[PDB]
Design a binder for these strands. Structure first.
Lengths: 64, 50, 79, 96
RNA sequence: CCAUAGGUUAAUGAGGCGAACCGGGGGAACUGAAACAUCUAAGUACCCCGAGGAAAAGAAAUCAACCGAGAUUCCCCCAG
RNA sequence: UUUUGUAUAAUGGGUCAGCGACUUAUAUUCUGUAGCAAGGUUAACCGAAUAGGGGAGCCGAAGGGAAACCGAGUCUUAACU
RNA sequence: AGGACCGAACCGACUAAUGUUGAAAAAUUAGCGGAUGACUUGUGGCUGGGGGUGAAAGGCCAAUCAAACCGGGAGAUAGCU
RNA sequence: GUUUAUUAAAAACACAGCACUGUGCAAACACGAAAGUGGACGUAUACGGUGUGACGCCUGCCCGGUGCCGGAAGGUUAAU
RNA sequence: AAUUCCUUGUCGGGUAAGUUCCGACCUGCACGAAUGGCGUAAUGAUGGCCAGGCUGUCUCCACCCGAGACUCAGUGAAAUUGAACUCGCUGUGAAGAUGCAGUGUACCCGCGGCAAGACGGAAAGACCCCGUGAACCUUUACUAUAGCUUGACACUGAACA
RNA sequence: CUUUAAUGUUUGAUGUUCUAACGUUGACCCGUAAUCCGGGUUGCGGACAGUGUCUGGUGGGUAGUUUGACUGGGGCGGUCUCCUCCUAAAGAGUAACGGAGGAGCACGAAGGUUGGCUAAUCCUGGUCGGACAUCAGGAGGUUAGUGCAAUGGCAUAAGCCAGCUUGACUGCGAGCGUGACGGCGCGAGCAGGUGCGAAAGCAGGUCAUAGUGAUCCGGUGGUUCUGAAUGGAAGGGCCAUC
């Protein structure tokens, strides 16, 4: 036994120069016909998991 | 219903374009408008609807 | 039938009272389409699309017993 | 990641897969350690003998960390404009 | 008819039973997906034909990538 | 034992004595504690075989970026910001 | 000649009553239907599990079957007592 | 007569007669991880599937739905 | 009407009276002609009503002979068992109290006989609902598939109209 | 450009002629006086079957599973998101199969801006010509109007009379509002180019709140960002997007 890395997380989250994990925002791909640039451009700065939400990936990324 | 969404392109055929909906039974003229280019930084006609 | 639904409350409540505000920007007293019932002045004249009273400046409300006729003309001020 | 059903956050985020696909052949060394080379030359052929990372390396890159103690001689490698200057200030040579 | 099937002598082999490992062939449902249908359960449980001190595998119609490695196998790593 | 409430026409119980239900292995956070320290550490294995050898390989010492790329700085930006 | 009568053997299970660890897991007592026909019965063999048998009831297949006896899958599965 | 061995034996089903439909005999039809057998050592007044009930007095209208056959004016149609 | 709201249709028969049986009429809410229409003979461990018989079934019970129950001996089981100084009536109350608030009534252990209770003893309630529980059964749900059938490739050959 | 036939020719199909693939649902004899059928010999049928695989169709003969939640039995009926209203007890919050209505779109104008305007209705007099539809007077008017609810506001009009036209645009943004969260609401202002106006000044759509839908999967416009020998390519990624 070794425990596996969870693909639910390892195709979603990445590691950075600060504690936690960095991810993209959603709601930017599917049907943009009613989405002005002020509702698209601002969905690219990325965000972190770092609170009680990190304890949900602590066994999903056991080797990150 | 089922009118199919319009695509509007500049005369260079580039990968920057506008998408919208139009009524099928009114004003049969081609949808065209003068707007900006994000690299050439000038106003051009966006056209070629359907 | 039709009932109860009612959906979203969307707030639109008061904030610009007494000595409210400080180190960060205030939204002021917000209302539901009534244009005169809580009127504005100075930095917080706002009213883009929802009658929010927003500014480029921070401080407390002055909240004074003066203003044209029945209108309050509420403003924030530097300390 | 189970949160009572209600479509969990790890499924609401978008999928990725495109990566640099070269870590198994690319070595990363820093001027703060294994940088004296015991009078020798810094080269990919001698890195494969320096008791570090093994023989499958096809590319070796240098980063500017710490200070340079010797007039070190380097042949090849991918070396930053800072690392090339930190070795110049110490009396060393960069052969390409 | 020539031959072969049958008959006959000598030689050599097979025949039944055991503990496990093992080769080839057949083969679930319940279960894991907090339901289920591809997926998983599982080529397991179980059955059939059979081999050896082991069986399986091996001295390249393999991988590599301009630099070469180089019979097979099991243990620790490459690596979750 | 258990269900707003239980002396409850709720529930269980004839009795004495044996036996009777949370284990370590894989990964990790928090906590204690210890050797070394910009380094730390061995696995399988070998070993006159709890010493010693074995440094494969891992963990750490540099980040920004899809990636090319750049790096004590960096992505997007005409960037000049 | 008689799926002919009256009626024992032989078969029946329509009905009441005594039973329900009773001598009894269909027996007892007393009525009471049929009885040369689709009758009644011995011994041997045949039909097997999704497969039999049945003028077809979830009835019959060793006191079970709308799916049996003996073991294994297995410590199946309870958002639960 | 037969059905529910044990809460029902009655009007169920069996059944001379009546009618349909498949079948030309390597029959139709059936059982099969398939040879082999059964139909039948028979042969259309024979065999398979099936609705109606001895014998009598008699037996209305409907092909619009679904199923099966017979057809080619039109819509549509596979491997290759 | 084993079909029908109103229904005990309604007229008449049978009767001291008859939701029951018959003769008849036909608003069959929604009978009906080979998943036939409808009637007889003959049959039935077959349906219903009337009348004669039988008689303690009933009116009203009583004796007569025997078996058990009754009393022991010998041999000796079964389900149950919180603890038992378990008595009325009224109140309170997990809201119908043996036991607590009030007021009344009983020698104790037996013993043949009864059974109004102790919500008795026996069933891990059947009832009704609930559970992305279980398993069968149907189909104009969903997904799979034999059988049968259309054309075809191949084993598979020569030629004339 | 045509409507098409015959000489010659390829072939689906049909017939006929033949035996080279093949059935043996023929026979005798050997094994052997074996009612079997292995062999041996000779017929019959014949490219028809038979045997393997493919293909369209018909499809419980055979197999597995699914068939929701809320409400004082269960169901039927109603409801499930967004917008709006009453209930909410004068702060924040909130319950009732408690009480009621709309939307699941439409406009290159119902958008942007420069210059102007103010409406409903009734009474009288007057015309076919109106409870009133053209006009004058007397009264009256966010009792008119907004692309459409319901509520709120509008003339310093956001309602409508004219003119000219896309700021219905690309990269950047201090931040603030709501909900446990995802999500959802609002936004000073820069640089680039555009629209209206003499100019100040204004515009990053629609008076304000509804016409909705994360991820997956697949597809399309651009692209020295990538592309397992090398170099292209196929497919990714980034940016645009259905």
């Amino acid at each position: 036994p070794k425990i596996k890395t969870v693909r639910g997380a390892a195709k979603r989250f990445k590691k950075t120069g600060k504690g936690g994990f960095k991810h993209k925002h959603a709601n930017l791909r599917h049907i943009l016909t009613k989405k002005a640039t002020k509702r698209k451009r601002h969905l690219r700065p990325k965000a972190m998991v770092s609170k009680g939400d990190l304890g949900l990936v602590i066994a999903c990324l056991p080797y990150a | 219903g089922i009118r199919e969404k319009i695509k509007l392109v500049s005369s260079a055929g580039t990968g920057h374009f506008y998408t919208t909906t139009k009524n099928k039974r009114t004003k049969p003229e081609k949808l065209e408008l003068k707007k900006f280019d994000p690299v050439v930084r000038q106003h051009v006609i966006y056209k070629e609807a359907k | 039938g039709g009932s109860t639904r009612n959906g979203r409350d969307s707030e639109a409540k008061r904030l610009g009272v007494k000595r409210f505000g400080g180190e960060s920007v205030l939204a002021g007293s917000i209302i539901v389409r009534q244009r005169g019932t809580k009127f504005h002045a100075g930095a917080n004249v706002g009213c883009g699309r929802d009658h929010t009273l927003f500014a480029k400046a921070d401080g407390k409300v002055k909240f004074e017993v003066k203003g044209p006729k029945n209108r309050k003309f509420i403003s924030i001020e530097a300390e | 990641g189970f949160e009572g059903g209600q479509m969990p956050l790890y499924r609401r985020l978008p999928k990725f897969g495109f990566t640099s696909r070269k870590a198994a052949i690319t070595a990363e060394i820093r001027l703060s350690d294994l940088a004296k080379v015991e009078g020798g030359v810094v080269d990919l052929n001698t890195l494969k003998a320096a008791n570090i990372i093994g023989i499958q390396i096809e590319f070796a890159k240098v980063i500017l960390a710490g200070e340079v103690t010797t007039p070190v001689t380097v042949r090849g490698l991918r070396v930053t404009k800072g690392a090339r200057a930190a070795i110049e200030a110490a009396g060393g040579k960069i052969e390409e």
